[PDB]
Design a protein around this ligand. Structure first.
Ligand SMILES: Cc1cc2nc3c(=O)[nH]c(=O)nc-3n(C[C@H](O)[C@H](O)[C@H](O)COP(=O)(O)O)c2cc1C
Ligand code: SF4
Lengths: 71, 245
């Protein structure tokens, strides 16, 4: 109850009868990634600290000049 | 009543024809009984072989020059019988392909076997076959042996009355498979299935017509596998070649 149902066309024996077409193509599609990776590329310590301190000093100087004008 | 067989445990020696003790004997033995009982049993035992003795009349027909029926003593070489009393086969051991020693209920005997087999109840019984009714058939090289076997199986289909199921169903099935194999419309696992069906029928019927329907195809796929496989392969190739267009 299987021969022609599975494949009738031209085989001589029960082996090499069917064509399946079920799973993956030859190659495993890829090597995939699973490990985390988060790059840390922001200005780390001294850049940000100098930015804060320098902009603070310069902002204070600007406040001084402005209060001079306003007076 | 209808012509159907009985169950054997009440053997026809204590429950037979009308329930009376009644035995059935073939016309051969009961017809030979007077002369064997008159001419003494030693004159009878002086024939055939040790355990198989007597004079039996064979009916040789099929593919001989002179189809005949003549009486010889058991354990006679088939070559001697055919070449001596009957006409020699159209080609003496040249185009003779198959031989069926017993009736149509006996597996075949290919050419290589039957060159030097004795004709009694044991020699060919030891080879594979059985003397049965001693109706030897010969088949030349120009006769499809699978077609002859298919026709025999059709006969057995057309005769099994069908009391118990194995013989009936299996015999219809055997005829169908043998036709499909004659044309060449099968595979190899199908011939193994043929052997399997043969074994089942032969085992498990009421009496010997099951064995009758099973034996010839068994002998065929026993001694003639190559040509059958060739038929199958050629049909498959022709089918592929035709389907390519
Ligand atoms: C399928 C089948 C076919 C038979 N055909 C015959 C037959 O043609 N002639 C016959 O005398 N007995 C026939 N018989 C019965 C057996 O041969 C039975 O053993 C025989 O009649 C009695 O054996 P005996 O007289 O040789 O001792 C047949 C049995 C079966 C199962
Ligand atoms: S083939 Fe067998 S089971 Fe069938 S009618 Fe004959 S003796 Fe009975």
């Amino acid at each position: 109850t299987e021969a022609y149902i599975r494949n009738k066309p031209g085989m001589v024996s029960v082996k090499d009868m069917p064509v399946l077409q079920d799973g993956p193509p030859p190659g495993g599609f890829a090597p995939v990634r699973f490990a985390r990776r988060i790059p840390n590329k922001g200005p780390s310590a001294v850049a940000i600290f100098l930015a804060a301190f320098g902009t603070f000093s310069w902002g204070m100087y600007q406040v001084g000049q402005g209060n001079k004008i306003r007076r | 009543k209808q012509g159907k067989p009985r169950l054997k445990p009440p053997f026809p020696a204590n429950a037979g024809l009308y329930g009376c003790p009644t035995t059935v004997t073939n016309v051969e033995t009961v017809a030979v009984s007077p002369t064997i009982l008159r001419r003494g049993p030693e004159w009878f035992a002086g024939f055939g072989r040790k355990n198989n003795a007597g004079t039996k009349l064979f009916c040789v027909s099929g593919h001989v020059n002179k189809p005949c029926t003549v009486e010889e003593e058991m354990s006679i070489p088939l070559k001697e019988l055919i070449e001596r009393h009957c006409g020699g086969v159209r080609g003496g051991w040249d185009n003779l392909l198959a031989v069926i020693p017993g009736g149509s209920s006996v597996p075949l005997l290919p050419k290589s076997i039957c060159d030097d087999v004795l004709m009694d109840y044991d020699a060919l019984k030891a080879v594979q076959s059985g003397l049965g009714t001693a109706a030897v058939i010969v088949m030349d090289k120009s006769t499809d042996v699978v077609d002859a076997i298919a026709r025999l199986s059709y006969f057995y289909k057309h005769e099994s009355c069908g009391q118990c199921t194995p013989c009936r169903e299996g015999t219809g099935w055997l005829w169908t498979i043998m036709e499909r194999m004659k044309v060449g419309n099968a595979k190899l696992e199908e011939i193994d299935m043929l052997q399997e069906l043969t074994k089942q029928i032969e085992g498990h019927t009421i009496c010997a017509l099951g064995d009758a329907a099973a034996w010839p195809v068994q002998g065929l796929i026993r001694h003639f596998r190559p040509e059958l496989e060739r038929r199958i392969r050629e049909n498959a190739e022709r089918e592929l070649l035709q389907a390519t267009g």
